[PDB]
C-alpha cells in the first residue's frame, strides 16, 4: 500500500509543515550570520576583535 513515508520523501516533506520548520530554521540562522556575523567577525578586516 502506497505511502510517501516509504516511497517519496518529497511529497512527505510537502505534506508536513513540521518538516518545513527545521529547514526554515536553518535558512534563517544562515541568513542571520550572513547579515550580521559575517562581515563583523569573520572578515579579515574584522577578525582582530577576537583578540
Amino acid at each position: 500500500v502506497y505511502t510517501n513515508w516509504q516511497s517519496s520523501y518529497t511529497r512527505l516533506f510537502v505534506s508536513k509543515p513540521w518538516m518545513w520548520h527545521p529547514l526554515a530554521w536553518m535558512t534563517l540562522s544562515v541568513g542571520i550570520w550572513w547579515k550580521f556575523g559575517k562581515e563583523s567577525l569573520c572578515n579579515e578586516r574584522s577578525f582582530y576583535i577576537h583578540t
Binding site: 500500500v1 505511502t3 510517501n4 513515508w5 516509504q6 512527505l12 513540521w18
Partner: protein, 319 residues
C-alpha cells in the same frame, strides 16, 4: 445457478476452516521461566545472593544475632538445591518477633531456635545434594489457575415453523392451515438467498485473516520470534490502515476508540478487554417500523380491499 440446498455445504466448509483456525489461536504463550531471562531480577536484589549448600537455616526470636550466622532478611535471595531442583528462594515477610539466619556447621545455634531446613554433611561431594523438604516441613502452594468459562458467542434463535408442517405431512403421507401467497414467498426467498450468499462471502473474506493470523501463530508456538512488522503483514487490512496513520504522522490514540465504541468511554484499559458481548447488534427487524407506518397512513377500506386483491388473485390462478 446456486440452489438453496447447497448453502449448508458451504457453511460446513467455512466452519471447518474457522475451527482449524481457532484450535490454533486458542493456544497462547505463557510466562517465560528461563532463569537466564530473569537472572537480573536476582542480581539487582538489595542483598547479595547466598549460595547455600551447607549448614542449616533457623528461625529464632529477634535480638542479638549469634556471631557467625548470616542474616536472611526480607529481600534476601538464596541459591539452593531443593529435592534435586536448583532454585532461588527470596525471603518475603518474615514474621514479627522473629528472624532467620543461615548457620554454618561451625556456628552454634542459640536456644529456642527452630531449624526450618537443613543440609547434610557431604564435604567430599563435588555436586551437592541440597535439601529434602518433607511433607509438613514446608507448605508449597501451587497457583490454582482456575480456567474460567470458555467465552461463548450468543447463538441467535431461528423459528422453523415449517418443520412441524413437514412432520404433519409425513403423518398424513390440506397439510397447511392457510393459503400461502407464492409470489411473496418467492420474493422473500430470492431476497434472503442473496443475503445469505453475500454473508458467506463476507465470512470467507474474514476467515482469510484468521487463517493468516493462525499460520503465524503456528510459528510463534514453535518458539520462533516474529518481528513487529513481519507480524503486521499477516494482518493485511490493519497493516494498511496502520501504515497510513504513520504517513499522516499522528501517533495519538484513544478517543477514536471512545467515539466509535462509546461503551469504552472512560475505560483506560479498553484494549485489554473483550466487551463484544456486552454490546451486540440488536435483533430488531426494521421492517416492523416500516409496515406500521404503512398501515397508519392507509385507511381501513384499503386494508379490506387487499383481502379482495388476494382472493381474486387466488381465483385467477385457479382458473
Amino acid at each position: 445457478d446456486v440452489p438453496i440446498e447447497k448453502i449448508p455445504e458451504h457453511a460446513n466448509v467455512l466452519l471447518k476452516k474457522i475451527d482449524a483456525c481457532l484450535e490454533i489461536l486458542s493456544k497462547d504463550i505463557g510466562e517465560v521461566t528461563d532463569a537466564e531471562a530473569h537472572e537480573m531480577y536476582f542480581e539487582t536484589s538489595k542483598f547479595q545472593i547466598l549460595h547455600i549448600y551447607t549448614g542449616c537455616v533457623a528461625s529464632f526470636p529477634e535480638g542479638d544475632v549469634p556471631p557467625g550466622a548470616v542474616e536472611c532478611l526480607p529481600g534476601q535471595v538464596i541459591r539452593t538445591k531443593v529435592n534435586g531442583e536448583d532454585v532461588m528462594l527470596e525471603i518475603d515477610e518474615v514474621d514479627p518477633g522473629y528472624q532467620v539466619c543461615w548457620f554454618k556447621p561451625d556456628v552454634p545455634l542459640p536456644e529456642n531456635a527452630e531449624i526450618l531446613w537443613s543440609y547434610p554433611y557431604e564435604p567430599t561431594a563435588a555436586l551437592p545434594t541440597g535439601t529434602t523438604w518433607e511433607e509438613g516441613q514446608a507448605n508449597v502452594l501451587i497457583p490454582a489457575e482456575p480456567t474460567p468459562e470458555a467465552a461463548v458467542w450468543p447463538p441467535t434463535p431461528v423459528t422453523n415453523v415449517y418443520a412441524p408442517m413437514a412432520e404433519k405431512l409425513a403423518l398424513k403421507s390440506p397439510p397447511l392451515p392457510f393459503t400461502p401467497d407464492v409470489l411473496q414467498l418467492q420474493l422473500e426467498h430470492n431476497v434472503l438467498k442473496g443475503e445469505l450468499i453475500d454473508r458467506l462471502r463476507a465470512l470467507e473474506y474474514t476467515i482469510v485473516t484468521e487463517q493468516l493470523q493462525a499460520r503465524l501463530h503456528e510459528r510463534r508456538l514453535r518458539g520462533d520470534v516474529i518481528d513487529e512488522w513481519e507480524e503486521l503483514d499477516y494482518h493485511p487490512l490493519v497493516r494498511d490502515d496502520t501504515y497510513l496513520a504513520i504517513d499522516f504522522g499522528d501517533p495519538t490514540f484513544g478517543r477514536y476508540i471512545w467515539k466509535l465504541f462509546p461503551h469504552t468511554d472512560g475505560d483506560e484499559e479498553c484494549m485489554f478487554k473483550d466487551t463484544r458481548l456486552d454490546v451486540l447488534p440488536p435483533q430488531v427487524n426494521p421492517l416492523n417500523a416500516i409496515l406500521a407506518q404503512h398501515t397508519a397512513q392507509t385507511p381501513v377500506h384499503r386494508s379490506l380491499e387487499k383481502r379482495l386483491w388476494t382472493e381474486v388473485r387466488a381465483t385467477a390462478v385457479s382458473e
